[PDB]
């Protein structure tokens, strides 16, 4: 009778990704740009996985050859979009790599901030995804590894995640980050200000970055 039925599971972040994100959601920090040059580094560790993978067996790449970076404003929607053709995830790597497990950088990087470090310095903990929550009050990530299927992990923080499968628009292989935007932040919807701050930032970043300003008609 429903046009489509699927499980959703709920799951509580460890303690100290919680109250990671608590900080980073809530805290005023005044270079919040960082969070793109985070997430587009993340892509670019992806893209650099399934890049190796491939080097041994090229049927690694039958899911994609392209292997690059999209950014994808939607005012209409108020989200911005990281897409990349990276190794991607399965549900294993989401329960376990977003949420469920703590490395020790999280509580290291929250001791630095304590200590007197500065938020910029979150990807050396290993943590900078949670960097997205400067700008944004959901994050939904979308996922496909190869031989898996297509899911999708989503939180608004406040201490759980929900993971499911996503049948909505098949991708080859790759992560979609989308940032539903606070509304103080929509700064980072501007073609302006998304080139210059990829310009700035991930100016080293060795795949191509394509800008794709989404608008429904
Ligand atoms: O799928 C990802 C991925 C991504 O491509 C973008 C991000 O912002 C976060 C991620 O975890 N990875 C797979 C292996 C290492 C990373």
Do not use: C
Not at 55 to 74: A, R, V, Y
């Amino acid at each position: 009778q429903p046009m489509e039925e699927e499980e959703v599971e709920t799951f509580a972040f460890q303690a100290e990704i919680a109250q990671l994100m608590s900080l980073i959601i809530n805290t005023f920090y005044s270079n919040k740009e960082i969070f793109l040059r985070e997430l587009i580094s993340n892509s670019s560790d992806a893209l650099d996985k399934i890049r190796y993978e491939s080097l041994t067996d090229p049927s690694k790449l039958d899911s994609g050859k392209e292997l690059h970076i999209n950014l994808i404003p939607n005012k209409q929607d108020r989200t911005l979009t990281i897409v990349d053709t990276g190794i991607g995830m399965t549900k294993a790597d989401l329960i376990n790599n977003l949420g469920t497990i703590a490395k020790s950088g999280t509580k290291a990087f929250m001791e630095a901030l304590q200590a007197g470090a500065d938020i910029s310095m979150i990807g050396q903990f290993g943590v900078g995804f949670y960097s997205a929550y400067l700008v944004a009050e959901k994050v939904t990530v979308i996922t496909k590894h190869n031989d898996d299927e297509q899911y999708a992990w989503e939180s608004s923080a406040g201490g759980s995640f929900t993971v499911r499968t996503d049948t909505g628009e098949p991708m080859g292989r790759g992560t979609k980050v989308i940032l539903h935007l606070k509304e103080d932040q929509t700064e980072y919807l501007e073609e302006r200000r998304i080139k210059e701050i990829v310009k700035k930032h991930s100016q080293f970043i060795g795949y191509p970055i394509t800008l794709f300003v989404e608008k429904e008609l």
